[PDB]
């Protein structure tokens, strides 16, 4: 059976939802679509609606919806955005052309945290373990974020975190992401905490690199040039003879640049600021690091069931694509209250 569907403007877009959601209110706009706040009649919370933009301009946008919802069905974490809802108004395949997203709302992001700050900085061992939580859970299903930064890091009033719009600046990438030395693994995304860690300590941004080349200056001048080891993985020869081109710098120690942190916390940063991906901290390691002895639990740090990534390789038409996303949203069951 399908609910009955009302239509409104709001931002000079379109919203057409089920009537069990009132109130919409825009919190959010962009390239990855348009949010609302919005009050959920049958379960009493408070929700966000995305509205997905273009999601079928082309193959890359069609595969991206596809990839989005497949994604966002799978996530079942505290620390991760779970989907409550997703629906068309479309009646059928053919008239097919609006996803709708809905989760739990979240006020607030990383750049703006003032409801959990304290004197201690104790809220930053708190919001660090959450984001550690949910990359152990992401990674052990082989999903990698490439992208995290404190703006796709959702906060609630009671400080509790969740990561959004994952598996889809340049100051929080990873040296080996931004061009490619040893192609990636996992622990890119921790790179990205550390980054992140840094900036919740000190309050300035660690690498605010201006372009690719002064981003990796910046990187160099705390991690040092690479090492022989490092030199060795280097299957690019044009990266190689760059690295080599520049004058060696050292490695800076890390207890005179975040002079006055908590050393647990600056041991931590030493780990996850490494160039060598193969020697960086994994997120399961990094959650048994004395910096969350008061938070860390080997009995609720959940993994996630395994995850289908085989459509990654295929080569569709975008209504092959189209018909793959209509079929997850037909399939959609929500969770269990
Ligand atoms: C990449 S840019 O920084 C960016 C920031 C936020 C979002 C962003 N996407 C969502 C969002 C909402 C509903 C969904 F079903 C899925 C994602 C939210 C959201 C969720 C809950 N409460 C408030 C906002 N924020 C997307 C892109
Ligand atoms: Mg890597
Ligand atoms: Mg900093
Ligand atoms: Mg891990």
Redesign the pocket.
């Known amino acids: 059976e399908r609910p009955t569907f009302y239509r409104q403007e709001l931002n000079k877009t379109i919203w057409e939802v089920p009537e069990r959601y009132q109130n919409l209110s825009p ?2 706009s ?4 348009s ?1 609302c ?1 919005a009050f959920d009649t049958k379960t009493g919370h408070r ?4 509205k997905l933009s273009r999601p079928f301009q082309s193959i890359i946008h069609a595969k991206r919806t596809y990839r ?1 919802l497949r994604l ?1 069905k799978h996530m079942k974490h505290e620390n991760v ?1 779970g ?4 629906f068309t108004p479309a009646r059928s395949l053919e008239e097919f052309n609006d996803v ?8 607030a ?1 990383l750049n703006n945290i003032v409801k959990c700050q304290k004197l201690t900085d104790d809220h930053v061992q708190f919001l660090i373990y959450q984001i550690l939580r949910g990359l152990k859970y992401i990674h052990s299903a082989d999903i990698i974020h490439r ?1 995290l ?4 890091l ?1 906060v609630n009033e009671d400080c509790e975190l ?1 990561i ?2 994952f598996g889809l600046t340049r100051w929080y990438r990873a040296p080996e992401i931004m061009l490619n030395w040893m192609h990636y693994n996992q622990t890119v995304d921790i790179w990205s905490v550390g980054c992140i860690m840094a900036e919740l300590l000190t309050g300035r941004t660690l690498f605010p690199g201006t372009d690719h080349i002064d981003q990796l200056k910046l990187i160099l001048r705390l991690v040092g040039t690479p090492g022989a080891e490092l030199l060795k993985k280097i299957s690019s020869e044009s990266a190689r003879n760059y690295i080599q081109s520049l004058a060696q710098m050292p490695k800076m120690n890390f207890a005179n640049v975040f002079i006055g942190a908590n050393p647990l916390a600056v041991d931590l940063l030493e780990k996850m600021l490494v160039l060598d991906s193969d020697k960086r901290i994994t997120a399961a390691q990094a959650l048994a690091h004395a910096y969350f002895a008061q938070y860390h639990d080997p009995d609720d740090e959940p993994v996630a069931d395994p995850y289908d990534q085989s459509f990654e390789s295929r080569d569709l038409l975008i209504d092959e694509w189209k018909s793959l996303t209509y079929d997850e949203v037909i399939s959609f069951v929500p969770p269990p209250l």
């Open positions: 919190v959010g962009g390239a990855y679509g949010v706040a929700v966000a609606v995305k989005e966002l955005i989907l409550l809802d997703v709708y997203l809905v989760t739990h709302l979240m006020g992001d992208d930064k404190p703006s796709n959702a969740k959004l719009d």
